[PDB]
Amino acid sequence: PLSETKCTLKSFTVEKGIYQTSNFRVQPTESIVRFPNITNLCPFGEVFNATKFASVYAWNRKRISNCVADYSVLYNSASFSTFKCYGVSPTKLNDLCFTNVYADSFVIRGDEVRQIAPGQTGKIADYNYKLPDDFTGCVIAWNSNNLDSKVGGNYNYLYRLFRKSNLKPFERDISTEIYQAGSTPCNGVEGFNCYFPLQSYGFQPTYGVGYQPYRVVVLSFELLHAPATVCGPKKSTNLVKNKCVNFNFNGLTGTGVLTESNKKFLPFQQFGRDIADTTDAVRDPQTLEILDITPCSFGGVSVITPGTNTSNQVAVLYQGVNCTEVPVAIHADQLTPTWRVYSTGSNVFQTRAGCLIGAEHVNNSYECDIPIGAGICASYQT
Amino acid sequence: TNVYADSFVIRGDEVRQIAPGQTGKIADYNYKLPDDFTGCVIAWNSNNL
Amino acid sequence: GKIQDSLSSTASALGKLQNVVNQNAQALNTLVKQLSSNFGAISSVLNDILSRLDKVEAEVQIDRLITGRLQSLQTYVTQQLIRAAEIRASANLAATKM
Amino acid sequence: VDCTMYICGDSTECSNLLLQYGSFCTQLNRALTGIAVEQDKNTQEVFAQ
Amino acid sequence: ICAQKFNGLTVLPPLLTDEMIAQYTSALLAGTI
Amino acid sequence: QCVNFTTRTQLPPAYTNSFTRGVYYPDKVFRSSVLHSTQDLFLPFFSNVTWFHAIKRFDNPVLPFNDGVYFASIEKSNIIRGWIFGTTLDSKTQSLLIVNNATNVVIKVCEFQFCNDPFLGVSNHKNNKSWMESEFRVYSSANNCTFEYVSQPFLMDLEGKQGNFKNLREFVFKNIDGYFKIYSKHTPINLVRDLPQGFSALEPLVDLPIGINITRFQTLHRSYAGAAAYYVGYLQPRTFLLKYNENGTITDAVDCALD
């Protein structure tokens, strides 16, 4: 502690008094991973390896849930020309659970791939596929001219050419009403300046890069405020209580001590949040009990020391701690302050300010030489 | 201070993995840059060679 | 004895002390509430930022978080210093009256 | 108020970025300890005559 | 107060307890009277 | 089949002051013993709710759906069971149908060509002592369908039974960027005419990726001796302050833009 104070004050000589230093905190002993124990693999093949993809004006949405996903086998495949995620890291998709997953599949051209990203402007963006500006998820795109482009001309993919107004995000429109591009209204199958809303392209392999067909899939999952039912392939671990642990519930990580709580979470309620928007109660995904989480014991540490030119002996005050946990604060697990020999005992004195170790409590009273607090003061005397 | 030049040949589509902090079969297994890389990266096609 | 009637019946008499306490509590409570704001980052909880984002892209949101929270503590410390100066003035007046 | 614990609670990746901001945390801690000592000085001045 | 304490916001106790302040008050009042 | 069963049958609509209704949990997260403020779609307090009462013969009109709708049902025997959402409902644009037709609840989006007077019909005590819904005269053409969902029937009655205390079925429907959110609650009351004066909170029930333009909607009846009432209110984007008690149940609310 004297060396730590010398390091904090940036001086070799320390004047008599009390000095706060970097506080102690109990490093968690082990880690907890609690996931729902579903085992069935998600039907990713039916999405990525489907026979025919839906048209862009009728993009196909699949609700993927109640299954185990492994995004590593998806990422490591180089067949995908474009693979970018917004709001999440592809390497971290494995380690975090998903509330609900929507996979959108369609076919576009290379030059319009940029239109897939949220907030962009283009025919696809303006008329048949608009992403919200706050999109989170991933997008994957890869050319399919070897599977979807025909020499005789493929006309089975269409898009909406004009609209009365730009579509809302994630809106799908199927109406085939004629667009009245001219001022005069019209009816019938066709009319002058009366464009048919759907327009197709001639898929043919001779087209260069930028006009080749591209199969595109978008994952638009939302995270961490709902009963997540999609998780990575990593196995869970056993549950322990009354110890500071690195817990991880459904991708929500944290460090703290767990206890059997009594807060009635409704069936749609999985997490409870405090005033600081931090988690305080959690529902286990395997057992339906409710547990309170508390940040394990930490508090400020002060060093009481007379003048270094008088002595090198110090005492340390752990503030705000009924420190019968100091015997539990053994260096089998780790603590932020390395030194622990002062925990030897038989010189521990408990005060309303915490506990002071390294000083002997006496009955006879003297003037407050060095203030400790709560009426207790320290001094250096024979 | 000192200059160290690393030379190799890879497939073109994985050239992005040469950038620092990236991941992939190249970055994760045979050539990883540090997060605080300072320097330059040069790449060119060599199928003709 | 009239003091006994004055203090026990009305409660606003000790208001000059109560506002000393409440403000501090409020000054603390707002400081806690500042941990709930995004400050431009995609998520308020730093654990969420660490979990969802890789060590390269996470840094830009995390830096926003430190910027906002450090500004919040700077404001709180400045307010505490001003309030402590006011309380020192009141305490010096009390010492003079004593 | 522990500056490190407040901004960067139980996270070392946050502390790595926080240490780039210099002695702001130390200044805040010093100011708060100064206020703490000032409180006892006020109490002793008022009552310990 | 627990939520405040959990993020590193500690309330330190006064050096002079309410009993010691009462003792100074009693001494001052006794001296005055 | 579908038959033009008479005209609109006069003008039913009345108006009522919804004292304290349209309260739901803004998010699926527990929170206790605090005062929490929220910015979202809600029902105004003391709002001018529209009241429809089924006193004979009658029709249920089509009403606009903009910005989500709060629905309430003062009812016995659970006559009201369905809803239609859309813009045109004549197969020109996509249209959605939710029906609890005895066996189960079906939620189905198709290019429905809805008939001008859709309804459901039942047969009472036909040699089985049971009541069977024979007629389903709601739509005529369903060319293309993108989403179909059947889970369970939702005739969720509560305690008391036999309709001794009138059942309030209170729901909130929203359609935000293709996510359709349905919040639901049921509660007994002992009041005869007006909307009961009291506080309650709505739990989130269903979220669907319907993704369809919806400008108007209609309700659905069970023609068999019985009357029922239903109320419609229009949600608005506003901020409200909620008092979460010790148990995390919304105990009281204040409208941040009422007075």
PDB file of N, CA and C in Angstrom, chain C residues 54-93:
ATOM      1  N   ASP C  54     -17.321  -5.934 -32.939  1.00  0.00           N
ATOM      2  CA  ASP C  54     -15.934  -6.366 -32.891  1.00  0.00           C
ATOM      3  C   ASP C  54     -15.044  -5.251 -32.350  1.00  0.00           C
ATOM      4  N   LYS C  55     -13.825  -5.630 -31.960  1.00  0.00           N
ATOM      5  CA  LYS C  55     -12.929  -4.714 -31.264  1.00  0.00           C
ATOM      6  C   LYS C  55     -12.522  -3.511 -32.105  1.00  0.00           C
ATOM      7  N   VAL C  56     -12.712  -3.557 -33.417  1.00  0.00           N
ATOM      8  CA  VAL C  56     -12.408  -2.432 -34.291  1.00  0.00           C
ATOM      9  C   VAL C  56     -13.574  -1.455 -34.369  1.00  0.00           C
ATOM     10  N   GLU C  57     -14.773  -1.954 -34.677  1.00  0.00           N
ATOM     11  CA  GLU C  57     -15.925  -1.077 -34.856  1.00  0.00           C
ATOM     12  C   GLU C  57     -16.565  -0.691 -33.527  1.00  0.00           C
ATOM     13  N   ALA C  58     -16.325  -1.463 -32.465  1.00  0.00           N
ATOM     14  CA  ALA C  58     -16.902  -1.118 -31.169  1.00  0.00           C
ATOM     15  C   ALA C  58     -16.317   0.181 -30.636  1.00  0.00           C
ATOM     16  N   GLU C  59     -15.054   0.458 -30.965  1.00  0.00           N
ATOM     17  CA  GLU C  59     -14.345   1.582 -30.367  1.00  0.00           C
ATOM     18  C   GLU C  59     -15.024   2.911 -30.663  1.00  0.00           C
ATOM     19  N   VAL C  60     -15.615   3.067 -31.849  1.00  0.00           N
ATOM     20  CA  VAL C  60     -16.215   4.356 -32.179  1.00  0.00           C
ATOM     21  C   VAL C  60     -17.454   4.625 -31.326  1.00  0.00           C
ATOM     22  N   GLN C  61     -18.259   3.599 -31.032  1.00  0.00           N
ATOM     23  CA  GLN C  61     -19.385   3.795 -30.121  1.00  0.00           C
ATOM     24  C   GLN C  61     -18.915   3.949 -28.681  1.00  0.00           C
ATOM     25  N   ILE C  62     -17.909   3.167 -28.288  1.00  0.00           N
ATOM     26  CA  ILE C  62     -17.427   3.239 -26.916  1.00  0.00           C
ATOM     27  C   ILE C  62     -16.871   4.627 -26.629  1.00  0.00           C
ATOM     28  N   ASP C  63     -16.124   5.197 -27.579  1.00  0.00           N
ATOM     29  CA  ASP C  63     -15.593   6.544 -27.407  1.00  0.00           C
ATOM     30  C   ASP C  63     -16.702   7.563 -27.211  1.00  0.00           C
ATOM     31  N   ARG C  64     -17.812   7.423 -27.937  1.00  0.00           N
ATOM     32  CA  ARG C  64     -18.968   8.281 -27.697  1.00  0.00           C
ATOM     33  C   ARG C  64     -19.475   8.109 -26.271  1.00  0.00           C
ATOM     34  N   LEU C  65     -19.495   6.865 -25.789  1.00  0.00           N
ATOM     35  CA  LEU C  65     -19.959   6.620 -24.425  1.00  0.00           C
ATOM     36  C   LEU C  65     -19.067   7.301 -23.390  1.00  0.00           C
ATOM     37  N   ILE C  66     -17.743   7.152 -23.515  1.00  0.00           N
ATOM     38  CA  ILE C  66     -16.847   7.847 -22.585  1.00  0.00           C
ATOM     39  C   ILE C  66     -17.000   9.356 -22.711  1.00  0.00           C
ATOM     40  N   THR C  67     -17.101   9.871 -23.937  1.00  0.00           N
ATOM     41  CA  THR C  67     -17.261  11.312 -24.098  1.00  0.00           C
ATOM     42  C   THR C  67     -18.485  11.814 -23.343  1.00  0.00           C
ATOM     43  N   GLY C  68     -19.637  11.182 -23.567  1.00  0.00           N
ATOM     44  CA  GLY C  68     -20.849  11.615 -22.893  1.00  0.00           C
ATOM     45  C   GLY C  68     -20.776  11.473 -21.385  1.00  0.00           C
ATOM     46  N   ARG C  69     -20.303  10.324 -20.899  1.00  0.00           N
ATOM     47  CA  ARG C  69     -20.303  10.089 -19.460  1.00  0.00           C
ATOM     48  C   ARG C  69     -19.284  10.975 -18.753  1.00  0.00           C
ATOM     49  N   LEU C  70     -18.137  11.213 -19.389  1.00  0.00           N
ATOM     50  CA  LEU C  70     -17.138  12.097 -18.809  1.00  0.00           C
ATOM     51  C   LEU C  70     -17.632  13.534 -18.783  1.00  0.00           C
ATOM     52  N   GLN C  71     -18.356  13.958 -19.824  1.00  0.00           N
ATOM     53  CA  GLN C  71     -18.983  15.275 -19.778  1.00  0.00           C
ATOM     54  C   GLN C  71     -20.010  15.348 -18.654  1.00  0.00           C
ATOM     55  N   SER C  72     -20.754  14.260 -18.440  1.00  0.00           N
ATOM     56  CA  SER C  72     -21.734  14.228 -17.358  1.00  0.00           C
ATOM     57  C   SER C  72     -21.066  14.367 -15.996  1.00  0.00           C
ATOM     58  N   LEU C  73     -19.973  13.636 -15.767  1.00  0.00           N
ATOM     59  CA  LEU C  73     -19.260  13.787 -14.501  1.00  0.00           C
ATOM     60  C   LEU C  73     -18.635  15.165 -14.371  1.00  0.00           C
ATOM     61  N   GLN C  74     -18.156  15.740 -15.473  1.00  0.00           N
ATOM     62  CA  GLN C  74     -17.615  17.089 -15.386  1.00  0.00           C
ATOM     63  C   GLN C  74     -18.680  18.075 -14.939  1.00  0.00           C
ATOM     64  N   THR C  75     -19.878  17.980 -15.516  1.00  0.00           N
ATOM     65  CA  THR C  75     -20.971  18.849 -15.096  1.00  0.00           C
ATOM     66  C   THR C  75     -21.333  18.609 -13.636  1.00  0.00           C
ATOM     67  N   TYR C  76     -21.415  17.340 -13.230  1.00  0.00           N
ATOM     68  CA  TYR C  76     -21.782  17.032 -11.850  1.00  0.00           C
ATOM     69  C   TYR C  76     -20.743  17.562 -10.871  1.00  0.00           C
ATOM     70  N   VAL C  77     -19.461  17.423 -11.207  1.00  0.00           N
ATOM     71  CA  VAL C  77     -18.399  17.894 -10.327  1.00  0.00           C
ATOM     72  C   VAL C  77     -18.403  19.413 -10.245  1.00  0.00           C
ATOM     73  N   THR C  78     -18.653  20.093 -11.367  1.00  0.00           N
ATOM     74  CA  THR C  78     -18.733  21.551 -11.325  1.00  0.00           C
ATOM     75  C   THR C  78     -19.896  22.011 -10.452  1.00  0.00           C
ATOM     76  N   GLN C  79     -21.056  21.365 -10.598  1.00  0.00           N
ATOM     77  CA  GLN C  79     -22.193  21.720  -9.757  1.00  0.00           C
ATOM     78  C   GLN C  79     -21.898  21.439  -8.291  1.00  0.00           C
ATOM     79  N   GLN C  80     -21.220  20.326  -8.005  1.00  0.00           N
ATOM     80  CA  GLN C  80     -20.859  20.018  -6.627  1.00  0.00           C
ATOM     81  C   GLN C  80     -19.891  21.047  -6.066  1.00  0.00           C
ATOM     82  N   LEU C  81     -18.934  21.506  -6.874  1.00  0.00           N
ATOM     83  CA  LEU C  81     -17.997  22.519  -6.401  1.00  0.00           C
ATOM     84  C   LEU C  81     -18.712  23.825  -6.085  1.00  0.00           C
ATOM     85  N   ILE C  82     -19.630  24.243  -6.958  1.00  0.00           N
ATOM     86  CA  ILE C  82     -20.368  25.479  -6.703  1.00  0.00           C
ATOM     87  C   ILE C  82     -21.239  25.338  -5.458  1.00  0.00           C
ATOM     88  N   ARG C  83     -21.932  24.205  -5.325  1.00  0.00           N
ATOM     89  CA  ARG C  83     -22.772  23.992  -4.154  1.00  0.00           C
ATOM     90  C   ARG C  83     -21.933  23.914  -2.886  1.00  0.00           C
ATOM     91  N   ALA C  84     -20.731  23.342  -2.978  1.00  0.00           N
ATOM     92  CA  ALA C  84     -19.853  23.271  -1.818  1.00  0.00           C
ATOM     93  C   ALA C  84     -19.354  24.651  -1.426  1.00  0.00           C
ATOM     94  N   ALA C  85     -19.097  25.514  -2.410  1.00  0.00           N
ATOM     95  CA  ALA C  85     -18.763  26.897  -2.085  1.00  0.00           C
ATOM     96  C   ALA C  85     -19.918  27.596  -1.379  1.00  0.00           C
ATOM     97  N   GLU C  86     -21.146  27.389  -1.856  1.00  0.00           N
ATOM     98  CA  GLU C  86     -22.301  27.987  -1.191  1.00  0.00           C
ATOM     99  C   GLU C  86     -22.443  27.463   0.236  1.00  0.00           C
ATOM    100  N   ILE C  87     -22.268  26.154   0.421  1.00  0.00           N
ATOM    101  CA  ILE C  87     -22.385  25.564   1.750  1.00  0.00           C
ATOM    102  C   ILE C  87     -21.266  26.049   2.657  1.00  0.00           C
ATOM    103  N   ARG C  88     -20.070  26.268   2.112  1.00  0.00           N
ATOM    104  CA  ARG C  88     -18.996  26.851   2.907  1.00  0.00           C
ATOM    105  C   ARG C  88     -19.333  28.270   3.334  1.00  0.00           C
ATOM    106  N   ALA C  89     -19.956  29.046   2.448  1.00  0.00           N
ATOM    107  CA  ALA C  89     -20.399  30.379   2.849  1.00  0.00           C
ATOM    108  C   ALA C  89     -21.412  30.298   3.984  1.00  0.00           C
ATOM    109  N   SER C  90     -22.382  29.389   3.866  1.00  0.00           N
ATOM    110  CA  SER C  90     -23.374  29.224   4.925  1.00  0.00           C
ATOM    111  C   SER C  90     -22.733  28.734   6.218  1.00  0.00           C
ATOM    112  N   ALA C  91     -21.740  27.852   6.116  1.00  0.00           N
ATOM    113  CA  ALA C  91     -21.081  27.322   7.304  1.00  0.00           C
ATOM    114  C   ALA C  91     -20.229  28.381   7.983  1.00  0.00           C
ATOM    115  N   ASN C  92     -19.578  29.242   7.202  1.00  0.00           N
ATOM    116  CA  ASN C  92     -18.841  30.355   7.789  1.00  0.00           C
ATOM    117  C   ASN C  92     -19.786  31.335   8.469  1.00  0.00           C
ATOM    118  N   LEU C  93     -20.953  31.581   7.869  1.00  0.00           N
ATOM    119  CA  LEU C  93     -21.951  32.412   8.534  1.00  0.00           C
ATOM    120  C   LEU C  93     -22.419  31.767   9.834  1.00  0.00           C
TER     121      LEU C  93
END
